[PDB]
Amino acid sequence: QVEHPAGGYKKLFETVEELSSPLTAHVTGRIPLWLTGSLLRCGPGLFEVGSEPFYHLFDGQALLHKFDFKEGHVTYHRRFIRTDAYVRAMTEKRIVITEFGTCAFPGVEVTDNALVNIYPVGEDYYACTETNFITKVNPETLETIKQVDLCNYVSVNGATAHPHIENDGTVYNIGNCFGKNFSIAYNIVKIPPLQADKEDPISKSEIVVQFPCSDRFKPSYVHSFGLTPNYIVFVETPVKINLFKFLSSWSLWGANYMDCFESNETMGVWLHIADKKRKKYINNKYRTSPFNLFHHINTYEDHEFLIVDLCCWKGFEFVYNYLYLANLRENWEEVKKNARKAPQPEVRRYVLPLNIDKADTGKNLVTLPNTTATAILCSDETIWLEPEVLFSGPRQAFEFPQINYQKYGGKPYTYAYGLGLNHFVPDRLCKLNVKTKETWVWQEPDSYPSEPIFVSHPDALEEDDGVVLSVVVSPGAGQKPAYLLILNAKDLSEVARAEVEINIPVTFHGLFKKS
């Protein structure tokens, strides 16, 4: 729709160097006085070790970024995370640890390249990827402190880079695991808040509940999940991990993680729910059409139903196949051409009935008045779901979604913020009213934003009283190569900017730390 023939988006994938200390950003407009804190973000910063390239978008070495709002000025800083992967790569001047889509050549050494997200646990902050290894970091200085191996504390093989954090600091996550059956399963991990004893909360990790797997030996790729005050929602997609293949290519040949994925063509999507407080899996066989899922938007309870809002990609093909660096660095026509056969992005609201009566076999159970979502109870005992579409644009994804999480996560809500992807290229920011379907767009030419993070006005009365923060890469004609953008959350109108004189590569997720 919008076109980027100048190819500026290639700057999102160009290596940068870390800083020794914070730069001072040149500020435009007016930073709100109540914005005092830090925006922390993780993404790849190093896309080749020497003349050895990294191939996939999720392979480049973790880079930790900070935009600080101190006493009426803004600074920018960045430091590579000192991971085994990074350290060993630097020691030995080559690629040492196999990344998601790049096999290294000379037990199994699983990557700790924490390029995806960062989150609070007790008084600590950890950078993560999606394996068992998270990296404790210093949120003031950006120094690496420690590697943690979650297998030491709990039985999981890995965990998402999207834990849910409750208001009391309790942390919930999900990862696959070995069941007692000698099957695969998915385990919900709970890390408690910092208690009086003042001991590291990770040492108090425990399993809340286990979800079954649709296939005994293949778990689905899980990127995120849903949490309400009373329920956990997990979506099992037809993107499957063939564990066999990476335990056959380690031994004999030589593979990466991407090589294990296969698509199951016939299962579609299975949706699973567990009672959070009683810690039981509920046996409701929710089923629907096939789609990839990376990001839940929000989840909530409305009478005897769960409302589940999702960023979907229609299809069973793995959308990550489209995310190799060569693909993303082609020119504009080839980018558009290459995405023509990709899965098509769509925001969807599914409605899952909680209180199932066989009396209603063969009818639509969704009796709520303001939705077009359906759930049908088959004789089978299967519950077949159709969504209400909330947003749909040709090869235009509303993605990397965020909400006013602190007051509205897990509860009834109205607004969602997101990054607009145009044939996979990030080129706009969106706001979406999920009840009316109104949208708002912020966009400028040759400008490539990141996930918008929302920060509440401390005296907020409405759900969107606050701002949205995005890191924007604007290559071009003598342009400030990048800047931090602050929008008014009500109408996505610009409030301010903090410009810098250096490039910033793609970042995925992060948080705003009030301090």
Q: Which residues are annotated as a binding site?
A: 162, 223, 295, 509
- Residue 2 binds to a second copy (criterion: CB under 8 A): no
Q: Which distant-in-sequence residues (6+ apart) come within 8 Å of 418 by Cβ?
A: 311, 398, 399, 400, 401, 402, 429, 430, 431, 432, 451, 452
Q: Quick check: 25 and 500 in contact, CB under 8 A?
A: yes
The tokens of 13 are what? 């994938």
Residue listed under structure tokens 């385990």 = 187
Question: Mask of contacts with a second copy, 241-270, x by CB under 8 A?
Answer: ----------------------x-xx----
Residue from 34, 172, 384, 440 touching a second copy (CB under 8 A): that is 384
Q: Which distant-in-sequence residues (6+ apart) come within 8 Å of 9 by Cβ?
A: 328, 425, 426, 427, 448
- Residue 438 binds to a second copy (criterion: CB under 8 A): no
Smallest distance from the beta carbon of 396 to a second copy, in angstroms?
Answer: 9
- Choose one: 166-174, 217-225, 363-371, 507-515; the region binding a second copy (CB under 8 A): 363-371
Smallest distance from the beta carbon of 157 to a second copy, in angstroms?
Answer: 27
3-class SS of residue 405: helix
- Residue 394 binds to a second copy (criterion: CB under 8 A): yes
- Residue 315 binds to a second copy (criterion: CB under 8 A): yes
Residue from 252, 362, 436, 459 touching a second copy (CB under 8 A): that is 362
111, 153, 161, 474 from 132: Cα distances, Å: 9, 11, 10, 35
Residue type (1 letter), 384: W
Residue from 2, 247, 326, 378 touching a second copy (CB under 8 A): that is 378
Q: Which distant-in-sequence residues (6+ apart) come within 8 Å of 412 by Cβ?
A: 300, 302, 307
The smaller minimum CB distance to a second copy, of residues 230 and 338, is found at: 338
Q: Residue 30: count other Cβ atoms within 10 Å of its Cβ.
A: 9
Smallest distance from the beta carbon of 154 to a second copy, in angstroms?
Answer: 36
Gyration radius from the chain CA atoms: 22
- Choose one: 33-41, 102-110, 223-231, 313-321; the region binding a second copy (CB under 8 A): 313-321
Smallest distance from the beta carbon of 216 to a second copy, in angstroms?
Answer: 21
The smaller minimum CB distance to a second copy, of residues 52 and 360, is found at: 360
- Residue 374 binds to a second copy (criterion: CB under 8 A): yes
Give how many residues touch a second copy by CB under 8 A. Answer: 40
Q: Residue 153: count other Cβ atoms within 10 Å of its Cβ.
A: 17
- Residue 436 binds to a second copy (criterion: CB under 8 A): no
Feature table: binding site for Fe cation: 162, 223, 295, 509
The smaller minimum CB distance to a second copy, of residues 2 and 378, is found at: 378
- Residue 365 binds to a second copy (criterion: CB under 8 A): yes
- Choose one: 55-63, 117-125, 182-190, 309-317; the region binding a second copy (CB under 8 A): 309-317
Cα 498 from Cα 75, distance rounded (Å)? 8
Smallest distance from the beta carbon of 265 to a second copy, in angstroms?
Answer: 5
Q: Quick check: 351 and 385 in contact, CB under 8 A?
A: yes
The smaller minimum CB distance to a second copy, of residues 252 and 359, is found at: 359
82, 150, 152, 159, 404 from 134: Cα distances, Å: 12, 8, 12, 9, 26
Cα 41 from Cα 510, distance rounded (Å)? 4
Residues lying near a second copy in the complex (CB under 8 A):
263, 265-266, 289-290, 314-317, 340-346, 360, 362-367, 369-374, 376, 378-380, 384, 386, 388-389, 392-394
